[PDB]
Amino acid sequence: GFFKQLTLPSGQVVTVSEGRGEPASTGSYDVRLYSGANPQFPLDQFIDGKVLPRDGSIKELKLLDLNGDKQPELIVVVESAGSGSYLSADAFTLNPQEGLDSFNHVEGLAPNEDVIQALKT
Amino acid sequence: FAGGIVSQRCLSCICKMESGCRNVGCKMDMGSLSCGYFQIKEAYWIDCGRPGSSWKSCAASSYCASLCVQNYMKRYAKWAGCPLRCEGFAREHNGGPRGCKKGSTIGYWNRLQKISGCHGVQ
Ligand SMILES: [Mg+2]
Incomplete structure (x- = not known):
């Protein structure tokens, strides 16, 4: 199951995970935001998280x-x-002042279509 | 093709739609491979019960690949609210577990029915 951790320019840290035990083709994922205050232990200070549907991997x-x-x-x-192989995407805002919030969603895009353009149009 | 809830004519039409019904090997689009007669990706093979020895070997066999499609539809189609006929199954095949409910697969179904012998296929 997908798991990735990223450090934001603010110093906050985010992880993204697919739901455990779910099928490959469908289910959920979650986004979890941490303060990143202690770089030795960057997942020690949880702030907020959200769970969203995923239509694919x-x-x-x-x-x-x-x-x-x-x-x-x-x-x-x-x-x-x-x-x-249609693409979908969710965008999230994340910062120390406001925390973690969804910003937009697109779906049904052709494989090679620019997801970022779609999220801005 | 493998038996199951999808009709033989429907499977033939999907096969023709995907590959002209030929073992075309694995093709890359966006760093992701889709393989064979039915253009099956790894996630699809995993969810259809991993028939055969591996994803790519299964995808290259008309029988194993179509068994995978049969198993995929058995797993997903009813529970997504799909009509249990080719309109539903084709759209699941193109669009995933809820493909039959997504506008993104409508053109696929409209076009698949233009293939000789596939108009109004059940
Ligand atoms: Mg910004």
Whole structure:
């Protein structure tokens, strides 16, 4: 099952995981935000987390500023298990001031379509 | 093809749609491989019960690959609310466990029915 940990430019830390025991093609994932206050133990100070549906498998995580506040949003990209390989994605805001919140969702994109463009249009 | 809840004509039409019904090997799109007669990816093979010795070997066999499709539909189609006929099964095949409920697979179904002998296939 997918698991990845990323340090944000703010020093906060995020993990992204697929749900345990779930099938490959469908289920959920979660995003968990930590303060990262102690770099020796970056998952020691949990702040918030969210669980979302996934229509496929997590393909990649991106950190990119979508709203223009010069801080990156987290984008979780998911690839359909069907032959069409359609992409979906959720974007999240995450910062020390406000915490962790969803920002947008897209789905049904062709394999090679720009997910970031779709989330900004 | 393997027997199960999907009809033989429907499987043939899906096969023709995906590959012209040929063992085309594995092709890369977005760093992800899709293989064989039915263009099955690893996640699909895992969920269809891992028939055969491995994903790529199964995908290259008309029988094993179609068994995988049969098992995938048995696992997912009913419970997604799909019609249990080719419109449903084709759209699951193209779109995953809820493909039959997603607009992204409508064109696939419309086009699949243009293949000779596949109009209104059940
Ligand atoms: Mg930003």
